[PDB]
PDB file of C-alpha atoms in Angstrom:
ATOM      1  CA  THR A   1     112.327  96.341  70.022  1.00  6.66           C
ATOM      2  CA  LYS A   2     110.345  94.522  72.726  1.00  4.12           C
ATOM      3  CA  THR A   3     108.510  91.271  73.293  1.00  3.75           C
ATOM      4  CA  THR A   4     106.138  90.339  76.075  1.00  6.39           C
ATOM      5  CA  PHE A   5     106.339  86.830  77.508  1.00  4.88           C
ATOM      6  CA  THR A   6     103.771  85.261  79.780  1.00  4.51           C
ATOM      7  CA  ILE A   7     103.726  81.942  81.704  1.00  7.93           C
ATOM      8  CA  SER A   8     102.275  80.349  78.648  1.00  8.09           C
ATOM      9  CA  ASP A   9     105.544  81.194  76.871  1.00 11.00           C
ATOM     10  CA  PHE A  10     107.424  79.022  79.365  1.00  8.66           C
ATOM     11  CA  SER A  11     105.137  75.947  79.330  1.00  9.55           C
ATOM     12  CA  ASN A  12     107.777  73.563  78.024  1.00  9.08           C
ATOM     13  CA  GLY A  13     110.563  73.952  80.474  1.00 10.74           C
ATOM     14  CA  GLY A  14     110.089  74.650  84.126  1.00  9.08           C
ATOM     15  CA  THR A  15     107.484  74.627  86.690  1.00 14.16           C
ATOM     16  CA  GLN A  16     104.609  76.396  88.402  1.00 15.14           C
ATOM     17  CA  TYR A  17     104.518  76.096  92.162  1.00 15.55           C
ATOM     18  CA  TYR A  18     101.380  76.089  94.275  1.00 12.42           C
ATOM     19  CA  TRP A  19     100.433  76.291  97.943  1.00 13.24           C
ATOM     20  CA  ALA A  20      98.826  73.627 100.085  1.00 10.52           C
ATOM     21  CA  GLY A  21      98.461  75.030 103.535  1.00  9.72           C
ATOM     22  CA  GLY A  22      97.489  72.403 106.013  1.00  9.17           C
ATOM     23  CA  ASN A  23      95.924  70.487 103.077  1.00  6.43           C
ATOM     24  CA  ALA A  24      97.753  68.890 100.170  1.00  5.68           C
ATOM     25  CA  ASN A  25      94.264  68.030  98.781  1.00  9.08           C
ATOM     26  CA  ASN A  26      93.272  71.650  98.372  1.00  9.76           C
ATOM     27  CA  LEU A  27      96.020  73.202  96.351  1.00  4.72           C
ATOM     28  CA  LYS A  28      95.817  76.866  95.528  1.00  2.51           C
ATOM     29  CA  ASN A  29      97.568  79.227  93.086  1.00  2.93           C
ATOM     30  CA  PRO A  30      98.390  82.660  94.352  1.00  2.00           C
ATOM     31  CA  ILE A  31      99.909  83.809  91.051  1.00  2.00           C
ATOM     32  CA  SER A  32      97.395  85.608  88.747  1.00  2.00           C
ATOM     33  CA  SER A  33     100.131  86.144  86.124  1.00  2.00           C
ATOM     34  CA  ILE A  34     103.795  86.576  85.269  1.00  2.00           C
ATOM     35  CA  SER A  35     104.844  88.831  82.448  1.00  2.00           C
ATOM     36  CA  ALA A  36     108.308  89.687  81.188  1.00  2.00           C
ATOM     37  CA  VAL A  37     109.143  92.411  78.629  1.00  2.00           C
ATOM     38  CA  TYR A  38     112.440  91.652  76.915  1.00  2.00           C
ATOM     39  CA  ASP A  39     114.208  94.376  74.902  1.00  2.00           C
ATOM     40  CA  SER A  40     116.334  92.860  72.150  1.00  2.00           C
ATOM     41  CA  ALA A  41     118.463  96.060  71.837  1.00  2.00           C
ATOM     42  CA  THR A  42     119.591  96.325  75.489  1.00  2.00           C
ATOM     43  CA  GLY A  43     118.912  92.845  76.813  1.00  2.00           C
ATOM     44  CA  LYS A  44     116.876  94.239  79.685  1.00  2.00           C
ATOM     45  CA  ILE A  45     114.014  92.105  80.908  1.00  2.00           C
ATOM     46  CA  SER A  46     111.324  93.697  83.065  1.00  2.00           C
ATOM     47  CA  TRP A  47     109.274  91.355  85.168  1.00  2.00           C
ATOM     48  CA  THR A  48     105.831  91.754  86.555  1.00  2.00           C
ATOM     49  CA  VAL A  49     104.285  89.275  88.991  1.00  2.00           C
ATOM     50  CA  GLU A  50     100.696  89.631  89.991  1.00  2.00           C
ATOM     51  CA  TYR A  51     100.358  88.054  93.415  1.00  2.00           C
ATOM     52  CA  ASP A  52      96.896  87.387  94.920  1.00  2.00           C
ATOM     53  CA  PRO A  53      97.004  85.782  98.322  1.00  2.00           C
ATOM     54  CA  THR A  54      93.476  86.955  98.866  1.00  2.00           C
ATOM     55  CA  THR A  55      91.978  83.523  98.327  1.00  2.00           C
ATOM     56  CA  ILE A  56      94.387  81.520 100.436  1.00  2.00           C
ATOM     57  CA  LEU A  57      94.108  84.175 103.210  1.00  2.00           C
ATOM     58  CA  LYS A  58      90.313  84.469 103.128  1.00  2.00           C
ATOM     59  CA  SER A  59      89.802  84.852 106.840  1.00  2.00           C
ATOM     60  CA  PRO A  60      88.460  88.037 108.377  1.00  2.00           C
ATOM     61  CA  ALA A  61      90.450  87.341 111.493  1.00  2.00           C
ATOM     62  CA  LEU A  62      93.385  88.721 109.378  1.00  2.00           C
ATOM     63  CA  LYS A  63      91.876  92.168 108.555  1.00  2.00           C
ATOM     64  CA  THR A  64      93.661  93.871 111.508  1.00  2.00           C
ATOM     65  CA  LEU A  65      97.102  92.588 110.655  1.00  2.00           C
ATOM     66  CA  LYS A  66     100.022  94.441 109.217  1.00  2.00           C
ATOM     67  CA  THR A  67     101.208  92.208 106.474  1.00  2.00           C
ATOM     68  CA  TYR A  68     104.421  92.087 104.537  1.00  2.00           C
ATOM     69  CA  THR A  69     104.877  90.807 101.009  1.00  2.00           C
ATOM     70  CA  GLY A  70     108.059  89.377  99.600  1.00  2.00           C
ATOM     71  CA  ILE A  71     109.517  87.946  96.382  1.00  2.00           C
ATOM     72  CA  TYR A  72     112.328  85.442  96.447  1.00  2.00           C
ATOM     73  CA  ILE A  73     114.305  85.574  93.241  1.00  2.00           C
ATOM     74  CA  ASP A  74     117.260  83.448  92.150  1.00  2.00           C
ATOM     75  CA  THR A  75     119.265  84.172  89.015  1.00  2.00           C
ATOM     76  CA  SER A  76     122.256  82.132  90.013  1.00  2.00           C
ATOM     77  CA  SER A  77     121.777  79.197  87.596  1.00  2.00           C
ATOM     78  CA  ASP A  78     122.129  81.600  84.661  1.00  2.00           C
ATOM     79  CA  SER A  79     125.447  83.154  84.092  1.00  2.00           C
ATOM     80  CA  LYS A  80     123.907  85.425  81.449  1.00  2.00           C
ATOM     81  CA  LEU A  81     121.277  86.763  83.765  1.00  2.00           C
ATOM     82  CA  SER A  82     122.477  89.137  86.408  1.00  2.00           C
ATOM     83  CA  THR A  83     120.953  89.658  89.849  1.00  2.00           C
ATOM     84  CA  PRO A  84     117.775  91.762  89.765  1.00  2.00           C
ATOM     85  CA  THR A  85     117.592  95.524  90.099  1.00  2.00           C
ATOM     86  CA  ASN A  86     114.929  98.054  90.987  1.00  2.00           C
ATOM     87  CA  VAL A  87     112.863  95.435  92.805  1.00  2.00           C
ATOM     88  CA  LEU A  88     109.579  97.018  93.805  1.00  2.00           C
ATOM     89  CA  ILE A  89     106.294  95.970  95.347  1.00  2.00           C
ATOM     90  CA  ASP A  90     103.181  98.067  94.739  1.00  2.00           C
ATOM     91  CA  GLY A  91     105.659 100.600  93.312  1.00  2.00           C
ATOM     92  CA  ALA A  92     107.382 100.954  96.686  1.00  2.00           C
ATOM     93  CA  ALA A  93     110.940  99.869  97.627  1.00  2.00           C
ATOM     94  CA  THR A  94     112.147  96.650  99.335  1.00  2.00           C
ATOM     95  CA  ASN A  95     114.773  95.376 101.866  1.00  2.00           C
ATOM     96  CA  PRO A  96     116.791  92.361 100.866  1.00  2.00           C
ATOM     97  CA  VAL A  97     116.920  89.354 103.166  1.00  2.00           C
ATOM     98  CA  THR A  98     119.766  86.955 102.455  1.00  2.00           C
ATOM     99  CA  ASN A  99     119.802  83.261 103.212  1.00  2.00           C
ATOM    100  CA  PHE A 100     120.066  82.599 106.940  1.00  2.00           C
ATOM    101  CA  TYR A 101     119.240  78.898 106.912  1.00  2.00           C
ATOM    102  CA  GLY A 102     122.596  77.846 105.353  1.00  2.00           C
ATOM    103  CA  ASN A 103     120.753  75.494 102.980  1.00  2.00           C
ATOM    104  CA  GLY A 104     122.898  76.552 100.058  1.00  2.00           C
ATOM    105  CA  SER A 105     120.161  78.363  98.091  1.00  2.00           C
ATOM    106  CA  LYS A 106     121.750  81.382  96.433  1.00  2.00           C
ATOM    107  CA  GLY A 107     119.296  84.134  95.673  1.00  2.00           C
ATOM    108  CA  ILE A 108     117.416  86.604  97.808  1.00  2.00           C
ATOM    109  CA  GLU A 109     114.088  87.593  99.361  1.00  2.00           C
ATOM    110  CA  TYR A 110     113.165  91.160  98.543  1.00  2.00           C
ATOM    111  CA  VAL A 111     110.661  92.149 101.203  1.00  2.00           C
ATOM    112  CA  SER A 112     108.441  95.208 101.268  1.00  2.00           C
ATOM    113  CA  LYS A 113     109.541  98.182 103.316  1.00  2.00           C
ATOM    114  CA  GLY A 114     105.944  98.948 104.186  1.00  2.00           C
ATOM    115  CA  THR A 115     103.074  96.823 105.423  1.00  2.00           C
ATOM    116  CA  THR A 116      99.498  96.507 104.230  1.00  2.00           C
ATOM    117  CA  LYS A 117      96.503  96.588 106.498  1.00  2.00           C
ATOM    118  CA  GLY A 118      95.101  93.145 106.039  1.00  2.00           C
ATOM    119  CA  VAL A 119      95.627  90.925 103.013  1.00  2.00           C
ATOM    120  CA  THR A 120      95.538  92.307  99.445  1.00  2.00           C
ATOM    121  CA  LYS A 121      96.620  91.741  95.845  1.00  2.00           C
ATOM    122  CA  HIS A 122     100.111  92.931  95.120  1.00  2.00           C
ATOM    123  CA  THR A 123     102.155  93.810  92.066  1.00  2.00           C
ATOM    124  CA  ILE A 124     105.797  92.872  92.218  1.00  2.00           C
ATOM    125  CA  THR A 125     108.215  94.151  89.583  1.00  2.00           C
ATOM    126  CA  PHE A 126     111.966  94.043  88.928  1.00  2.00           C
ATOM    127  CA  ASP A 127     114.562  94.129  86.162  1.00  2.00           C
ATOM    128  CA  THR A 128     117.261  91.667  85.217  1.00  2.00           C
ATOM    129  CA  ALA A 129     120.034  92.414  82.738  1.00  2.00           C
ATOM    130  CA  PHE A 130     120.502  89.617  80.146  1.00  2.00           C
ATOM    131  CA  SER A 131     123.841  89.347  78.301  1.00  2.00           C
ATOM    132  CA  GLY A 132     122.782  86.869  75.606  1.00  2.00           C
ATOM    133  CA  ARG A 133     121.126  87.244  72.224  1.00  2.00           C
ATOM    134  CA  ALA A 134     117.489  86.330  71.679  1.00  2.00           C
ATOM    135  CA  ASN A 135     118.375  82.713  70.823  1.00  2.00           C
ATOM    136  CA  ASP A 136     119.893  82.155  74.239  1.00  2.00           C
ATOM    137  CA  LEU A 137     116.557  82.744  75.820  1.00  2.00           C
ATOM    138  CA  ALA A 138     116.128  78.962  75.329  1.00  2.00           C
ATOM    139  CA  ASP A 139     118.325  78.677  78.455  1.00  2.00           C
ATOM    140  CA  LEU A 140     117.034  81.487  80.663  1.00  2.00           C
ATOM    141  CA  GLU A 141     116.777  80.066  84.134  1.00  2.00           C
ATOM    142  CA  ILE A 142     115.152  82.133  86.865  1.00  2.00           C
ATOM    143  CA  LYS A 143     112.970  81.315  89.864  1.00  2.00           C
ATOM    144  CA  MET A 144     110.408  83.492  91.581  1.00  2.00           C
ATOM    145  CA  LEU A 145     108.275  82.913  94.682  1.00  2.00           C
ATOM    146  CA  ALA A 146     105.849  85.376  96.155  1.00  2.00           C
ATOM    147  CA  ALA A 147     105.148  85.081  99.895  1.00  2.00           C
ATOM    148  CA  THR A 148     103.124  86.824 102.516  1.00  2.00           C
ATOM    149  CA  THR A 149     103.978  87.057 106.223  1.00  2.00           C
ATOM    150  CA  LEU A 150     101.427  88.057 108.832  1.00  2.00           C
ATOM    151  CA  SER A 151     103.737  90.177 110.958  1.00  2.00           C
ATOM    152  CA  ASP A 152     107.442  89.564 110.603  1.00  2.00           C
ATOM    153  CA  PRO A 153     109.514  91.281 107.832  1.00  2.00           C
ATOM    154  CA  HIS A 154     112.465  88.927 108.145  1.00  2.00           C
ATOM    155  CA  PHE A 155     111.829  85.865 106.060  1.00  2.00           C
ATOM    156  CA  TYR A 156     113.427  83.713 103.381  1.00  2.00           C
ATOM    157  CA  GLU A 157     111.015  81.519 101.473  1.00  2.00           C
ATOM    158  CA  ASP A 158     113.047  79.977  98.708  1.00  2.00           C
ATOM    159  CA  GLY A 159     111.241  76.880  97.598  1.00  2.00           C
ATOM    160  CA  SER A 160     113.572  74.501  99.223  1.00  2.00           C
ATOM    161  CA  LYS A 161     110.987  72.399 101.086  1.00  2.00           C
ATOM    162  CA  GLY A 162     107.999  71.107  99.153  1.00  2.00           C
ATOM    163  CA  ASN A 163     105.921  68.176  97.912  1.00  2.00           C
ATOM    164  CA  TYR A 164     103.300  67.159  95.350  1.00  2.00           C
ATOM    165  CA  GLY A 165      99.491  67.380  95.105  1.00  2.00           C
ATOM    166  CA  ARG A 166      96.806  67.716  92.366  1.00  2.00           C
ATOM    167  CA  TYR A 167      95.744  70.959  90.576  1.00  2.00           C
ATOM    168  CA  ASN A 168      93.459  70.653  87.597  1.00  2.00           C
ATOM    169  CA  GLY A 169      94.202  66.944  87.907  1.00  2.00           C
ATOM    170  CA  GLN A 170      97.985  67.029  87.400  1.00  2.00           C
ATOM    171  CA  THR A 171     100.725  66.378  89.905  1.00  2.00           C
ATOM    172  CA  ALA A 172     101.455  69.856  90.925  1.00  2.00           C
ATOM    173  CA  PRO A 173     104.317  70.642  93.185  1.00  2.00           C
ATOM    174  CA  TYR A 174     103.638  72.814  96.205  1.00  2.00           C
ATOM    175  CA  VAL A 175     105.822  74.820  98.582  1.00  2.00           C
ATOM    176  CA  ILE A 176     106.192  74.223 102.303  1.00  2.00           C
ATOM    177  CA  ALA A 177     107.080  77.308 104.244  1.00  2.00           C
ATOM    178  CA  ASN A 178     110.493  77.391 105.851  1.00  2.00           C
ATOM    179  CA  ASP A 179     108.941  79.234 108.756  1.00  2.00           C
ATOM    180  CA  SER A 180     106.358  81.962 108.898  1.00  2.00           C
ATOM    181  CA  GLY A 181     105.773  82.643 105.240  1.00  2.00           C
ATOM    182  CA  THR A 182     102.422  81.739 103.799  1.00  2.00           C
ATOM    183  CA  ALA A 183     100.461  81.859 100.519  1.00  2.00           C
ATOM    184  CA  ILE A 184     103.675  81.004  98.697  1.00  2.00           C
ATOM    185  CA  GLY A 185     103.647  80.345  94.968  1.00  2.00           C
ATOM    186  CA  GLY A 186     105.670  81.060  91.908  1.00  2.00           C
ATOM    187  CA  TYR A 187     107.427  79.777  88.905  1.00  2.00           C
ATOM    188  CA  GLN A 188     110.762  78.481  87.756  1.00  2.00           C
ATOM    189  CA  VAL A 189     111.703  79.420  84.225  1.00  2.00           C
ATOM    190  CA  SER A 190     113.876  77.038  82.314  1.00  2.00           C
ATOM    191  CA  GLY A 191     113.875  78.316  78.800  1.00  2.00           C
ATOM    192  CA  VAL A 192     111.492  80.408  76.793  1.00  2.00           C
ATOM    193  CA  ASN A 193     109.485  78.023  74.638  1.00  2.00           C
ATOM    194  CA  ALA A 194     111.295  77.395  71.370  1.00  2.00           C
ATOM    195  CA  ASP A 195     108.559  79.094  69.301  1.00  2.00           C
ATOM    196  CA  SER A 196     107.903  82.152  71.396  1.00  2.00           C
ATOM    197  CA  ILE A 197     111.533  83.253  70.908  1.00  2.00           C
ATOM    198  CA  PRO A 198     111.679  86.355  68.703  1.00  2.00           C
ATOM    199  CA  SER A 199     113.195  87.295  65.411  1.00  2.00           C
ATOM    200  CA  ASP A 200     116.761  88.733  66.364  1.00  2.00           C
TER     201      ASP A 200
END
């Protein structure tokens, strides 16, 4: 049977990633939530990311644009977690963009096939097969970064460039776009918190 995990179930290991635009003193979080439903019987995990670039991309000068959304996902540090399947955005399909910067990041940007007039909330979902038992969720390593682009569907915003600011008075890392991506944010999982792991 199934268990739902949220960001708060990953607190202990791994990292939330924010966006400074032209302003490391005004960090912003474009992730409303991340939610993963793990089925102990099959090992399937179903992810749901709620992306909201709406606050970063406030401007009305953007209303006429045909935007693309994308999710970069890397499952390469876990040998028990397989690449993702059925990657959707707003329930629609995606094209994969593979790393064209030769920076050694493994892992892939799944970009929407369709555009969106203007800037809106989005709901990204995908599946990842997991070949371990519940206990091995203490070592689940996966990284996810939502991005928007204003016109171009060919982008790869892994989190490879970045730096640190303040968000709720911490030292919060933020992403720097490789190119033309914007409102980037996301999370790196590095183990499900010891005490949110289920019964198995």
